[PDB]
């Protein structure tokens, strides 16, 4: 349905987050796996990433994705969104921060989307298991058998059973918006957000709407800027800095809450 994306749009947005084994090293990746939930009886797992699915930049148009490519919420078509543990997982659904897939047993969980210049693949060390139903061990659901009650993640987009809270982003550090104008540190502003800054001796500690050049610092290395924004919220992740604006205990429904079905 459509209103779920319209409570997932209101203030939620992508965010870059720390990611281990991003390819061959550690990343501040745009799609960072956190809190993967493997507990169903068919190897079906739902993972909370840090890049919005479904939502394009104006509506939903449920074939697109949007991620935080630096300082612009860039949207693309979902071309190859792949999930693997030991073999590729046949992903079944995606909504907001969450992917839901049918994975074989493995010892890692790695996801990635294609964009064309880069791969942006993240990986997390999780012990994903294949829990059978009943009193016989399988390693893949069969063609025929008895219909037993099993707890599985519903593919339905909408449910009000459980929520996660959305919190105002912290102060996103950025050193790429400072330069030397003539011989002094100049602080460019992204034209739509105010940037806080801090330099050699303590300076203006609340930021400013427009650009400025500080004479107390002549080297970019000793002054830096925390870009701030209060127009789009994020989900309070353990790998994001909490803002001094300790308010707004918001809400965000979890799409694929567990249900009782037949296996």
């Amino acid at each position, epitope marked *: 349905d459509l209103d779920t994306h319209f409570t997932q*749009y*209101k203030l939620a947005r992508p965010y870059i987050a720390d990611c281990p084994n991003c390819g061959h090293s550690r990343c501040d990746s745009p799609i960072a796996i956190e809190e993967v939930r493997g507990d169903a009886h068919a190897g079906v797992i739902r993972i909370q990433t840090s890049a919005m699915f479904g939502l394009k930049t*104006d509506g939903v148009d449920l074939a697109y994705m949007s991620f935080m490519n*630096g*300082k612009t*919420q860039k949207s693309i078509k979902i071309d190859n969104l792949h999930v693997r543990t030991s073999a590729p997982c046949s992903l079944v659904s995606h909504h907001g921060y969450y992917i839901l897939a049918q994975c074989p047993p493995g010892d890692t969980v790695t996801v990635g989307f294609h964009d064309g210049p880069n791969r942006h693949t993240c990986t997390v060390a999780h012990k994903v298991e294949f829990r059978p139903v009943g009193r016989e061990k399988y390693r893949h659901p069969p063609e025929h058998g008895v219909e037993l009650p099993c707890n599985r993640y519903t593919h339905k987009r909408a449910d009000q059973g459980h929520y996660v809270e959305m919190h105002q982003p912290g102060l996103v550090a950025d050193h*790429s918006l400072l330069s030397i104008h003539s011989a002094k540190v100049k602080i460019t502003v*992204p*034209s739509g957000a105010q940037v806080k800054y801090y330099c050699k001796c303590p300076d203006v500690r609340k930021g400013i709407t427009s650009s400025d050049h500080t004479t107390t610092c002549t080297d970019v290395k000793q002054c830096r800027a925390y870009l701030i924004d209060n*127009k789009k919220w994020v989900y309070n992740s353990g790998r994001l800095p909490r803002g001094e604006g300790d308010t707004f205990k918001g809400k965000l429904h979890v799409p694929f809450v567990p249900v009782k079905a037949k296996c």
Partner: antibody
Amino acid sequence: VVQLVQSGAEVKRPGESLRISCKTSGYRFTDIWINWVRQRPGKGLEWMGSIYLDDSDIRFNPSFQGHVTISADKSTSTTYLQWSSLKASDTATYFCARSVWSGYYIGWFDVWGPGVLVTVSS
Amino acid sequence: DVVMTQTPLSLPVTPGEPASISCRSSQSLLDSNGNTYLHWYLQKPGQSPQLLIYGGSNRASGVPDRFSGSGSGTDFTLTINNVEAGDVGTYYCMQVIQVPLTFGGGTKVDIK
């Protein structure tokens, strides 16, 4: 479909006030920048200002302080462009345009209004 | 403040062959993450302008495959693979990186 609509074209005299309005429809989020731009007769456009609907955060051109004011209303999802004392140089088309939030930047103006024509002569 | 320049200030052309328009800015529009903050708008005579290309290279909705954007750093180029009669009007390159965000001087494309 999304529709952006402004008030009709108007003729005014110098020295009085004026308020034109631009209304958004077919798009039910308030996480939007709505902005004003002036095209003079036969000359190009000049970005004049921008306002974010949610927090009423302003972004002014340095050539239009005091002369002009931009405000917003949540319930009707409208932006008001207000002039206190129109001048002989305010004869132009004014377009209200829509730029959805995309990072920390004003973005791209995907849909524009029909365009009001405000003329002040002597 | 940044100043934008368009070349040519007017472009006569017939349907059937491509067209190019080069916009230029005082300083680079790129970021450390490699993303261009340009927007190419088209205004046909009579009605309001409409967004034609966004992001400098990315393509806005509704417009045809025909048009294209390219370039880097300070120099950016709009290309039309083959013009039609419908593309008469004014093209405008605009940047966003610094307030005030200013449109270009403009260029006018008309049937020869």
